[PDB]
Design a protein around this nucleic acid. Sequence first.
DNA 1: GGGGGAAGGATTC
DNA 2: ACGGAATCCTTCCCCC
Length: 341
Amino acid sequence: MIVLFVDFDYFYAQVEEVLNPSLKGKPVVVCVFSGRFEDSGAVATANYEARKFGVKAGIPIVEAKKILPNAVYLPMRKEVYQQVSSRIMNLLREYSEKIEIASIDEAYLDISDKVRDYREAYNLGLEIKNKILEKEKITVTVGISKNKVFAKIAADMAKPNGIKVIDDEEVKRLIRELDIADVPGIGNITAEKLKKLGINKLVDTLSIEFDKLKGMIGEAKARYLISLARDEYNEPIRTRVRKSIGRIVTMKRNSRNLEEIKPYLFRAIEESYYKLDKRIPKAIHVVAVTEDLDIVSRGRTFPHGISKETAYSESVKLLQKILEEDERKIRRIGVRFSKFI
DNA sequence: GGGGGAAGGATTC
DNA sequence: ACGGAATCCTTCCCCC
Ligand SMILES: Cc1cn([C@H]2C[C@H](O)[C@@H](COP(=O)(O)OP(=O)(O)OP(=O)(O)O)O2)c(=O)[nH]c1=O
Ligand SMILES: [Mg+2]
Ligand SMILES: [Mg+2]
Ligand SMILES: [Mg+2]
């Protein structure tokens, strides 16, 4: 089994560069303005010109304008980046019908047939790499190794517009070299608990007691990190399917009043039923961000699909129980739709 | 004990 | 200043 993974580079940012090359060369910050005050909101993603200076996503736009005050600031446009993705994704399937679409900028393959040996994989690299680079004008990093995981680390250590392969011999040198945070599935919150147990490099996950993992990072994670440590891991590529949809609007100003919220909750439903197109959600949730940025949702599954009417009716029933079980005000309010039929 | 779920909060990206 | 989309994990319950 041989895996050729692909990460679309600074995708949102890049797309816009393809939709107006005048940018390709300049710093570019894509961001969702919340509308409250001028330039309020956050960065969605930044290219390497803007990132190479501290501008990354999640950070306030204002802080951004503070570091790079002469960068192009463009609102985000998901739809477009969503199709420029599909046009590309379909352009990968003609390389294996068994590909795994992880994200919008990630696809998983298994050219175990198409390519046995590595140097041979390394070429199916520049050939999938050179083609998506000539059809949609997009440049993407390629990662090659034994499983899906070391495939990310592959593209991770060589992106952007890069390439790298990890001989099975290397999937062994990094098990003891690679920090634990650079491990796919590991985010800061987890890279800590682990450091608190003592762990740092992959391999260190066998030292500590197994019940010492379970309790600190869950067992799914435990078995997960244990596996890769033994070179075993080896998991099958899987077509994968989105199993939830939802929008999360931003209050012009914090609101605790069930009527100032309403107009928002409904922009969220519509902007979910449209994205939902042809999917019947048996379950629905309501997410609401408490002013001091804490989240608190509510839900409810039905024995049948949810008609847009039910979608408002119960939508309002859940927001209320929040405004009730809690007391903070609300900065963000959305709606999740899951468990389709 | 645990399967079959439902829910709300947590963590990743 | 502190968006946004999804899923991952731990918990509670029901009735066998
Ligand atoms: C880490 C992090 C990422 N994100 C968004 C911003 C990053 O661009 C994205 C993760 O990207 P990555 O996949 O980590 O890097 P990338 O270049 O492959 O992604 P992209 O092609 O979009 O640039 O997730 C957040 O919104 N908050 C976060 O804390
Ligand atoms: Mg990407
Ligand atoms: Mg990504
Ligand atoms: Mg990580």
